Design an enzyme around this catalytic site. Sequence first.
Site, mmCIF file in Angstrom:
data_model
loop_
_atom_site.group_PDB
_atom_site.id
_atom_site.type_symbol
_atom_site.label_atom_id
_atom_site.label_comp_id
_atom_site.label_asym_id
_atom_site.label_seq_id
_atom_site.Cartn_x
_atom_site.Cartn_y
_atom_site.Cartn_z
ATOM 1 N N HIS A 314 0.814 -1.206 0.000
ATOM 2 C CA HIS A 314 0.000 0.000 0.000
ATOM 3 C C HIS A 314 0.859 1.272 0.000
ATOM 4 C CE1 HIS A 314 -2.720 3.154 1.744
ATOM 5 N NE2 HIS A 314 -3.433 2.702 0.728
ATOM 6 N N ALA A 315 0.626 2.113 -1.006
ATOM 7 C CA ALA A 315 1.370 3.356 -1.185
ATOM 8 C C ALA A 315 1.345 4.207 0.082
ATOM 9 C CB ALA A 315 0.776 4.142 -2.342
ATOM 10 N N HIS A 344 0.238 12.250 -5.099
ATOM 11 C CA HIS A 344 -0.441 12.197 -3.820
ATOM 12 C C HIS A 344 0.579 11.970 -2.716
ATOM 13 C CE1 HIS A 344 -3.608 10.889 -0.906
ATOM 14 N NE2 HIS A 344 -2.672 10.037 -0.530
ATOM 15 N N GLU A 345 1.415 10.950 -2.893
ATOM 16 C CA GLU A 345 2.441 10.613 -1.916
ATOM 17 C C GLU A 345 3.471 11.715 -1.811
ATOM 18 O OE1 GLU A 345 2.336 8.150 0.133
ATOM 19 O OE2 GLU A 345 0.469 7.372 -0.736
ATOM 20 N N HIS A 348 2.463 14.351 0.612
ATOM 21 C CA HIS A 348 2.814 14.021 1.992
ATOM 22 C C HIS A 348 4.220 14.475 2.341
ATOM 23 C CE1 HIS A 348 -0.770 11.927 2.805
ATOM 24 N NE2 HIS A 348 -0.491 10.821 2.143
ATOM 25 N N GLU A 372 -3.877 14.565 3.098
ATOM 26 C CA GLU A 372 -4.183 13.742 1.946
ATOM 27 C C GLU A 372 -4.515 14.594 0.717
ATOM 28 O OE1 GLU A 372 -3.727 10.570 2.186
ATOM 29 O OE2 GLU A 372 -3.730 10.337 4.358
ATOM 30 N N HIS A 474 -7.246 -0.699 4.954
ATOM 31 C CA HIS A 474 -7.318 0.221 6.092
ATOM 32 C C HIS A 474 -8.037 -0.352 7.289
ATOM 33 C CE1 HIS A 474 -6.473 2.675 2.643
ATOM 34 N NE2 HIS A 474 -6.234 3.726 3.406
ATOM 35 N N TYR A 484 -10.052 10.697 3.704
ATOM 36 C CA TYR A 484 -10.079 10.679 2.242
ATOM 37 C C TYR A 484 -11.353 11.334 1.697
ATOM 38 C CZ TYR A 484 -6.391 7.227 3.030
ATOM 39 O OH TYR A 484 -5.263 6.567 3.482
HETATM 40 ZN ZN LIG Z 1 -2.210 9.643 1.501
#
Ligand SMILES: [Zn+2]
Length: 586
Positions: A314-315, A344-345, A348, A372, A474, A484
């Site tokens: 999972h990313a 997206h990452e 972060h 997020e 999750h 999210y």
């Molecule tokens: Zn995220």
Amino acid sequence: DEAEASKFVEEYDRTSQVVWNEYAEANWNYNTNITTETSKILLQKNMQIANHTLKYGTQARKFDVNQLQNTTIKRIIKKVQDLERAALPAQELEEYNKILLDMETTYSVATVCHPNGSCLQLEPDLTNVMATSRKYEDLLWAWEGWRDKAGRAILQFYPKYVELINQAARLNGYVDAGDSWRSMYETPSLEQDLERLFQELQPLYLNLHAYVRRALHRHYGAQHINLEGPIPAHLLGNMWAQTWSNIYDLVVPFPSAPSMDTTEAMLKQGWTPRRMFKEADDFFTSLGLLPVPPEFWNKSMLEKPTDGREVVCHASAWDFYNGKDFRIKQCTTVNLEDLVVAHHEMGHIQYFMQYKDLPVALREGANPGFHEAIGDVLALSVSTPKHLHSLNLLSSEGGSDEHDINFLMKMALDKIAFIPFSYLVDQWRWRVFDGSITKENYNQEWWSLRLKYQGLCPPVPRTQGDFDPGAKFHIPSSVPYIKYFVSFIIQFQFHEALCQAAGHTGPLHKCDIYQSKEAGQRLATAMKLGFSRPWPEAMQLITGQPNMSASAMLSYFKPLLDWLRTENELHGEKLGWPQYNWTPNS
Ligand SMILES: [Zn+2]
Ligand SMILES: *[C@@H]1O[C@H](CO[C@@H]2O[C@@H](C)[C@@H](O)[C@@H](O)[C@@H]2O)[C@@H](O[C@@H]2O[C@H](CO)[C@@H](O[C@@H]3O[C@H](CO)[C@@H](O)[C@H](O)[C@@H]3O)[C@H](O)[C@H]2NC(C)=O)[C@H](O)[C@H]1NC(C)=O
Ligand SMILES: [Cl-]
């Protein structure tokens, strides 16, 4: 005394950096190399951080927080009085940590096998099946097999997890774990706010749902699709039916305006997982935001190892709490969907870099939804046909209404369809936490919400022993999901505001903020606050107003809503699923 509270905060921060840093590497080493050794070490470091948490958590509770003049100190001390799992007695803490690792390991190593030969994993094999197969039965085999292996195997842990996570929360002054997770937003009106927001997007979602259902009817046949009923959960191109963009080929509004095969295009031009992160890194620097440090490239795991190594796929993005070492772990596949995930990452990572000078306790998003949202905001611009063409992954699509409505459908299948899934997950978990849903009803109540919010039914009736929520990452990894939902609402508010700031005129979905320093500054000032202020301050800084609001999202998609309404009417669709009891006869 004020000064005794200031000393404590300084002491908590110095020792947290060291302790949280050692933890981070242990957790990293297991996540990128699941073994028995790394498993043991992580469990030992868990006890160590718990011991640091307990010590300072106990000191923190000897202070009356609301009798303290400085707000920033008051805010740090309050947080430190919440020990989370470290509030548990030793025996229970040990059981809880073991259970979490057991659930996570179970999820990450589960496979679905043909008895004849090959054994498939979730990423990339089963994912790719859900994305590309157009055979009802082959999709069914993957959808059910995944749930038979991961879901059913998690069920044995969950009631005990729920018991211990609730114990922990009650010992930290909450009424249960869901209560504690909602508190992260510091918004008493949260449930009502989220509901209001969900209702605002119903026109767009129900119209999208009916249109996709129609196109499914067309392809898989009338005997397998009820046009007044819910859609079977395995036909939407994704294992959890949370985003639907992979069935774009089945639903394209204007087939006469075709798009370049972006996967074919990236592969043919020599895009690697590494090149996909360099490109996201460039977007961020174009805005005046920070570049990822050299260390990021040396230590990140940007693809699935070819090594035998078992890993958690999972990313995700990692802060090591020294202000220099930040990493991504992702099992990157070379395609457009993972280009978005890379952004997206990298969002972060930018958030980490922006707030690295704050006390460690304030090193998180204004709220979890903000964390997020950052990457996704840039991804909205990257995703425009205009921008993708400049990366040579699409040919020109400009100045034609047909391509324009096609693009918006492509975006809608990811953005709008995720609205109800993202809302549903913690509606179920919150009710699990407060005892409204017992282990007798885990699954039934899951599918009632799947029906109610998303309009999905299970393609195969569910049997005793199933625990479908265990088949979503999750749930067993114990990661809160409502973030999210918040994220998908606010990223469009951010897009709108940044576009305004950059001088863009015309429809919002055509905006691309690449290279806007004015856009950069806004994000930067907000990200620097970290968790130092209540989240409306950050929202205000970015958007000039303090609320969450669906307006930006409805405006982005407004031209699609008009087009869906006309189209659905033309075919006489019933919006919703009035025949809600329907399930596949087969
Ligand atoms: Zn995220
Ligand atoms: C309430 O206290 C906060 C926290 O500040 C501090 O924490 C205590 C535990 C002690 O360690 C203090 O010595 C420490 O300052 C105060 O916030 C801080 O305010 C100062 C004053 O503006 C900020 O200084 C800036 O630092 C940057 C460097 O990046 C310079 O560029 C600026 O020119 C300026 O010097 C400091 O960054 C800020 N820190 C945080 C985390 O907020 C706050 O002022 C205080 N509030 C009141 C009303 O007294
Ligand atoms: Cl499911």
